[PDB]
Amino acid sequence: EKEQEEAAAASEELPVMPWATSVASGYTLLRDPHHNKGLAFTEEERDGHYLRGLLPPAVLSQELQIKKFMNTLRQYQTPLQRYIAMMNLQETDERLFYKLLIDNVVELLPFVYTPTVGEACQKYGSIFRRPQGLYVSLKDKGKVLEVLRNWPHRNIQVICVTDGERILGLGDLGCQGMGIPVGKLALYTALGGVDPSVCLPITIDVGTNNEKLLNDEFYIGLRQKRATGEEYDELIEEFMSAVKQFYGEKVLIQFEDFANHNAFDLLEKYSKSHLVFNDDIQGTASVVLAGLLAALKMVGGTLAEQTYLFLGAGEAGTGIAELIALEISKQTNAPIEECRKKVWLVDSKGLIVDSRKGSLQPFKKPWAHEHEPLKTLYDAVQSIKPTVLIGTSGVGRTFTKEIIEAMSSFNERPIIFSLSNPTSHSECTAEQAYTWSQGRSIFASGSPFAPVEYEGKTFVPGQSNNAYIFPGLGLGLVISGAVRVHEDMLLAASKALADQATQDNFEKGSIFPPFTSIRKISAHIAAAVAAKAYELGLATRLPPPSDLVKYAENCMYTPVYRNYR
Amino acid sequence: ELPVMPWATSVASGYTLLRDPHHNKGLAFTEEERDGHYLRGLLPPAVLSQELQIKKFMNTLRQYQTPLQRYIAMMNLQETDERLFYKLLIDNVVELLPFVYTPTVGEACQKYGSIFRRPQGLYVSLKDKGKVLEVLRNWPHRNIQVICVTDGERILGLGDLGCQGMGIPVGKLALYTALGGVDPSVCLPITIDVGTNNEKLLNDEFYIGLRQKRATGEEYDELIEEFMSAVKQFYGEKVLIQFEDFANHNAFDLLEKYSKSHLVFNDDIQGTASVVLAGLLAALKMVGGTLAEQTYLFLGAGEAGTGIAELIALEISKQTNAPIEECRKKVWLVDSKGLIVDSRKGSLQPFKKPWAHEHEPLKTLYDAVQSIKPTVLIGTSGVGRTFTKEIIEAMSSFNERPIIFSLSNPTSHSECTAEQAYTWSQGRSIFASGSPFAPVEYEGKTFVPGQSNNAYIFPGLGLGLVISGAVRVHEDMLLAASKALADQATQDNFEKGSIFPPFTSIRKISAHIAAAVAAKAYELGLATRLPPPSDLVKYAENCMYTPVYRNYR
Amino acid sequence: EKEQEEAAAASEELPVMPWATSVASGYTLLRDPHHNKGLAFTEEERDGHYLRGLLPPAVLSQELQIKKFMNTLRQYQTPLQRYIAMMNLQETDERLFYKLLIDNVVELLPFVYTPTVGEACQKYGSIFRRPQGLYVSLKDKGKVLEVLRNWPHRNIQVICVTDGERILGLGDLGCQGMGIPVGKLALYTALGGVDPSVCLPITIDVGTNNEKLLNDEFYIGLRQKRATGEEYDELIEEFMSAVKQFYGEKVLIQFEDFANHNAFDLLEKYSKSHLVFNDDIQGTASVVLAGLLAALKMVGGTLAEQTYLFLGAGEAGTGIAELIALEISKQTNAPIEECRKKVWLVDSKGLIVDSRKGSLQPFKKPWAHEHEPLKTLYDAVQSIKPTVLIGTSGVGRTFTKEIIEAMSSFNERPIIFSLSNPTSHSECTAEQAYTWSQGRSIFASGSPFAPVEYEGKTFVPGQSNNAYIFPGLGLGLVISGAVRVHEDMLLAASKALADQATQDNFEKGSIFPPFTSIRKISAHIAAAVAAKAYELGLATRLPPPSDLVKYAENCMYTPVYRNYR
């Protein structure tokens, strides 16, 4: 049952690569990112491994290395140039890359992650390219396993995969979506402590509809429009087959930036066979719920009493909403469609209403309450009189002065969540939200914003981005050996994050603690998601450790240089 | 009894192939090559040409704000895809040369320690003495033909950059490939670290060298003669050893002591002398006359100073049949103390006495320019803006077309700019300089000043010594080269005011210099590739590295 | 001219393999024959290269290694078992293999070379196979260069190639012919001093007519009868093209054991374009002529005055004959057909006579003198009354008591040369020749025979095998950079060998000095073949060295262990 090795003795016609292992020295060692210490190679290590001469005489510490890279990183003018310098270092000295990124996480995160990582994806083809991650194309059908075999690590625990269809709020970037999986997985290591070597960034190229990229001569993908239905599905179910055969069932498959229709069928179909998780639906839902709980500690109240208005009824829209209604059902013991009575979503066509359900998309019907057709978010804000406004539209500056002022007029402390990324697609800025609400809004957003000054006070807006959740939640599914993801684990995580939000960060108007604590946060989220995994009896690392927090911290990758023969 | 390294050879595929600069083609790997070498998946589906690769790198190179940032991006590419790096450098040589070579390469050396470093070249320290050969053994190419070596004492006109001198040898050797067609694999950039006197670098916490002041006499000498021993045992005698940026004192003893035992060449003394003489011959086609008739004034009596002068006097001796001591009558050098005159021989340096003619002490270059009344003003001072308006105006007043050569590098140490020389001479000067200057406009006419930099000479001269198997460097080969370059200078480049053809032709130039230096090697009977080929130019062109992508499936 | 690098800068769409170079240590080093020293790895070398533990504590010398292998070689009791143990060592420790073979050359030569190497070829498919040499099949056509590219040494100086059609006197062993090229090239190193790494054993598989091997389930070749004419030719000319492109023109191509018709067209059409040499035609001719000159020092006389009878008018038959007639023409200044008048060959159909030439094979017509048709060698021996009887028949025991007695009756010291191999196909034994001639014959043979006793005296029959010639002749063509073979170099060699034959070896009845001198012999043959190359102006290593013998000895591979760091 929990060691069903009947499926693992189909290892006869499994394609395999005959790997050889050899001691690394000279240029082989220096060109190996996993080991390469650059000038930090001690005198003794250089004599030992035929480096003497290939390096200058000077031996640097890792700390001096960080100071030196930081100095040259700050002299690049555009953010994209600092992204290029960061990806280059990741792929030359992996230990210096991670030790630097952790020690400088607040300064560097906007460059490796949102918002820079968005530009990187738009211009991926034209950017100086050391290869990272694995690309499975439509032309790898029949031979997806052959492609997996090429990856030179067998022990994969975390996969992060996109088909590039909805990269942040920028839409279809086809095969250039790879920036995201590579980003997420770097964070899995820096924020969560997952070892880099067990992380596998994948992109599924099925084409792109982006006309700019079809006609751009530097596009790295198939010059064809996306395959649909039949043709798409077979690649996916062969991919899902192949992952299973190669890596087993305990391998986490984190879906990133798929379209609505797809992102749901993948969570539906593969929930039973695989350990599947969707950062857009489940991960965002998780961090938002934690933000709400953290908000209601500053202002007071429960989730039950609040009224919720969403711009954008996609993945994150319905996904966040469903996790809120569920948390209410656990707190209230009500039937679920009494918990969503006070949750309203507005899409492209306006407020989701029952009168409109005679031609609605299926995953929206549960939010089609009874109300007059409303055309704009402004009309809904004024009619519904919500306590909480969450934006998942992918459209910038849709939280207008009229809308934040309207929200500041009936709420005394309105909860405004501007979730879309990158910064240019933020529904509002931190400056707009604090100004148009006379310093009275509880504000958080997807992309980072500098502190805002208003009537002699400083507001540090919190970052409501799933990067606070998935590093801890992933580590948890792994260190417990969870075989399935349960809605109850998303809640366990949300709890854990919210319970790290103290007065230190509330003082400054931030629903979350600073990223300078993300190692502590990830351990507590991991311990909780593991505890829930055991309770639900979906864990396979039996017996559970006594102290799930201290265990989670002991499983965590550290990028300090260890010494070689 | 020989220390020896057990090298093992293996077929490269997957990440081993991609991480190997020598072979890595990035997206230019064809579909067939990817299936063949376990790349399928590790690269995105799209296959680029090398040409699209060039266009792409060029586009992102121009978005960097500083020259130093484009130098870092160039050195990164050299060390990830060597064939793309060289095919790019060739196709874009005029645009890119100032970034990989003078003047950028100077800043790169000043800030070498603080710059993002993929390792290139070999460092032999004072702590490798006794074991220098052991260090050589670590280089993973056995067939070395061209070595380029500095001890960092005088990097361009920037002085002592100690161990951070490595930027220069790495630069020269890239040019040996790009300009000359030498294969990269046979080129070995070396730096000898013996310390540095630069107090800023001793106290800088990113300095990559020994934190000590330079070893002198005894201790220095031992390392060098052990280096020179070790190179010869490992690579043989036909290996070219190009010395770069040593001090006067040393750069001479190295050419003196190792002329017999080794094939030694000094870019500062011999290489610069060579390109200057070629510039003079090219100048005298625009303006008219012979070397004999001209009068020469130098600022700076160092390596390049006396070196250029001696090669000029020699070319005069071969054209007039006069004794050498008679061909120096027309050639005057001005140092720190003023005009070199015989009157002060009661405490003179020895290698200056041959230029100590008959005259009573003059104090400043301005005094000398006015008294000596020269035809040709050459600056090898290492000091910027020492060719003043008064000096260029003085020179423009008595000559109708005065020859001004501003040789010092980088641009910041140029004795004058191209703009100053053409303005202060009313458009009448024949100007060339060490570091590149953009075209200069003067009443609706465009002046393209030539680049009198040894990069026009050493790529051809090196290729020549190699393809002929020359075992020694002969003063007559410097002349053979000078002639060959000068005889490439047509009216197309003279029209625009340039003594040299554009770098867009450096492949033609290097082949003709190689054929000449080889021909002279055979004639003097120092060549060992016998018999000489019938057509030494077509042979030289066929021996030339091409960086077009080599085919794997 | 000479340096035509025009064809070397037309290597742009040449297939190439991307080789990577890396420092060898641990199991990579031990499994590498070129470097592997086994227990002879010094303490310092083991610490240095991560061997400590993988070897027992004991450090052996190379000498102790030799004593140890020799001891275990003598417990194998078939010769074939000692051939297998020898090939295994060649392919695990190359330096121990060569240092052993040289120091023990007389004892070991019959096991790695004739006659053992013959059995090895007959049973090649069924023998335990460590892989050796390169096989180019009919199904590698279009892609022969691709096959060459796979060999992991670029700098090839000596190729040795067979199509397996006439392996020794055993006939067609198809693809199992490889034993020969591998044998020859080991000797090129042990006897001649050529570095192993510049030597490339090749077999061209075009099928086989051996019905035994077509139906044998362990045959390693194509299960088809030999391709003829058009199909054969294209593979060869593509092979000869491909060798040229990859290795250049200075590469020696030694043909081994082809049939007459082929062996000749290959020397004819590729004499201009390539440096081609045929061990059967030219190499055997060379050592035989040296034997004759050595014989005429024991007994007295000139080549001119002798009368020659050959059994077997093939490659070696006509080839030996033509080299004899040529040496006569250079000594007498006579027209060539006056030099052939006293040379008679007997084939399958009997004595070659002009009355039979109305349907003769082409390369036999020059030996078709005027005489009455004779059916058997015995009839010819008795009619022609020859002074020299040479057997190249491939048929054992055809030099009968009647024939040796007949020869002993009209000559006082008859020269009998039993050239065929292996021992089982020898035209007579050393025992038979000395007994049936009352101790009066000058005898030599292709395969080794122990000393023979007769009337209280010891006869040490010499070995007239091309292994005395091709090691020196090859080294010569290489160290001079010869671009052509000229008949005059075969003679230069023959002279050089003959002039090494002293009274020390003549005392015991041997035309050649023992193989314990083959280092000295090869250097003197090399210096002579080089001198002739320069004289004929076909050498490209100009100027010639002062002392061609001491230069040849300094170019010679030594298998003493190198010390590693």
Consult the annotation and say whether B154 binds a ligand: yes
What DSSP designation does A205 have?
Answer: E
Distance of alpha carbon C226 from alpha carbon C217, whole angstroms: 18
For residue B432, what is the enclosing H or E element? strand B430-433
Residues in C closer than 8 angstroms to A50, CB to CB, are: 23
Q: How was this structure determined?
A: X-ray
Distance of alpha carbon A540 from alpha carbon A544, whole angstroms: 9
Residues in B closer than 8 angstroms to C6, CB to CB, are: 542
Residue of A nearest to C565 (CA): A50
In angstroms, the separation between the Cα of residue A360 and the nearest Cα of chain B is 38
Tokens at C206, concatenated: 């075009």
Q: Which of residues 62-101 of B touch A (CB under 8 A)?
A: 63-66, 69, 73, 76-77, 80
φ, ψ for residue B407 (rounded to 5)?
-90, -35
For residue C463, what is the enclosing H or E element? strand C462-463
Tokens at B211, concatenated: 């934190």
What DSSP designation does B245 have?
Answer: S
DSSP readout, C405-451?
A: HHHHHH-SS-EEEE--SSGGG-SS-HHHHHHTTTT--EEEESS----
Residue of B nearest to A52 (CA): B135
User: How remote is the C-alpha of C394 from its chain's centroid?
Assistant: 16
Residues in A closer than 8 angstroms to B206, CB to CB, are: 64, 68
Tokens at B106, concatenated: 């100077």
- Which of the other chains make 3 or more beta carbon contacts under 8 angstroms with chain C? A, B
In the sheet with C415-418, reading across from the earlier edge strand, the strands are: C350-351, C343-347, C308-311, C388-391, C415-418, C442-445, C462-463
Q: How many CA atoms lie within 13 A of B519 on its CB side?
A: 19
Note whether C291 and C511 are within 8 A (CB). Answer: yes
Query: A152–B14: do the CB atoms touch at under 8 Å?
Result: yes
| Cα–Cα distances in angstroms (integers) from residue C484 to residues A269, B488, C199, C544, in the given order | 74, 41, 19, 17
Tokens at B207, concatenated: 């300095």
Residues in A closer than 8 angstroms to C50, CB to CB, are: 23, 565
Sorted by sequence, the CB contacts under 8 Å of residue B57 that are 6+ apart come out as A128, B73, B77, B84, B88
Distance of alpha carbon A412 from alpha carbon A432, whole angstroms: 17
Distance of alpha carbon B410 from alpha carbon B170, whole angstroms: 17
| Paired strand residues for B217 | none
Sorted by sequence, the CB contacts under 8 Å of residue B428 that are 6+ apart come out as B396, B400, B401, B402
Tokens at B365, concatenated: 């270059």
Note whether C514 and C464 are within 8 A (CB). Answer: no
DSSP readout, A99-151?
A: HHHHHTHHHHHHHHSTTHHHHHHHTGGGS-----SEEEEGGGTT-HHHHHHTS
Burial (Cβ within 10 Å: 0-12, 13-18, ≥19) of residue A48: middle
Q: Does A298 touch chain B (CB under 8 A)?
A: no
Sorted by sequence, the CB contacts under 8 Å of residue A144 that are 6+ apart come out as A136, A235, A238, A239, A241, A242
Note whether A210 and A171 are within 8 A (CB). Answer: yes
The sign one gets for the Cα dihedral C14, C17, C18, C20 is: negative
What DSSP designation does C460 have?
Answer: -
Strand A134-137 to C134-137 pairing: unpaired
**Chain A interface test: which of C19, C23, C47 (most A C-beta within 10 Å):** C23
Cite the beta strand spans of C100-169 per DSSP E: 134-137, 158-162
Note whether B290 and B322 are within 8 A (CB). Answer: no
Catalytic residue at A561?
Answer: no
Strand A350-351 to A343-347 pairing: antiparallel
Residues in A closer than 8 angstroms to B20, CB to CB, are: 31
Sorted by sequence, the CB contacts under 8 Å of residue B34 that are 6+ apart come out as B40, B43
Measured in residues, chain C has a length of: 565
Query: C22–A22: do the CB atoms touch at under 8 Å?
Result: yes
Please choose, from the candidates C296, C360, C371, the residue with its C-alpha nearest in 3D space to the C-alpha of residue C328: C296
Q: Which of C18, C562, C565 sits opposite B12 (nearest CB)?
A: C18
Distance of alpha carbon B359 from alpha carbon B342, whole angstroms: 7
Consult the annotation and say whether A209 binds a ligand: no
Tokens at C329, concatenated: 């023409």
Distance of alpha carbon B388 from alpha carbon B377, whole angstroms: 12
Residues in C closer than 8 angstroms to A19, CB to CB, are: none
Q: Which of B65, B116, B135 sits opposite A53 (nearest CB)?
A: B135
Please choose, from the candidates A440, A516, A523, A442, the residue with its C-alpha nearest in 3D space to the C-alpha of residue A194: A523
Query: C17–B9: do the CB atoms touch at under 8 Å?
Result: no
Q: Does A19 touch chain C (CB under 8 A)?
A: no
Cite the beta strand spans of A256-319 per DSSP E: 275-278, 308-311
Tokens at A332, concatenated: 């209230």
For residue A472, what is the enclosing H or E element? helix A470-480
Residue A59: Cβ within 10 Å count: 17
Please choose, from the candidates A168, A159, A166, A133, the residue with its C-alpha nearest in 3D space to the C-alpha of residue A270: A159
Catalytic hit among A83, A98, A113, A219: A113
DSSP readout, C23-40?
A: E--HHHHHT-TTT--GGG
Sorted by sequence, the CB contacts under 8 Å of residue A465 that are 6+ apart come out as A114, A287, A421, A446, A447
Sorted by sequence, the CB contacts under 8 Å of residue C510 that are 6+ apart come out as C444, C460, C461, C462
Q: Which of A131, A143, A221 sits opposite B42 (nearest CB)?
A: A131
- Which residue stretches of B145-212 are H helix? 167-178, 199-203
Catalytic residue at A232?
Answer: no
Cβ contacts below 8 Å, chain A against chain B, sum to 138
List the Cα angle C438/C440/C443 in 5-degree steps.
110
In angstroms, the separation between the Cα of residue C546 and the nearest Cα of chain B is 16
Note whether A343 and A321 are within 8 A (CB). Answer: yes
In the sheet with A308-311, reading across from the earlier edge strand, the strands are: A350-351, A343-347, A308-311, A388-391, A415-418, A442-445, A462-463
Burial (Cβ within 10 Å: 0-12, 13-18, ≥19) of residue C508: middle
Please choose, from the candidates C226, C206, C227, the residue with its C-alpha nearest in 3D space to the C-alpha of residue C138: C206
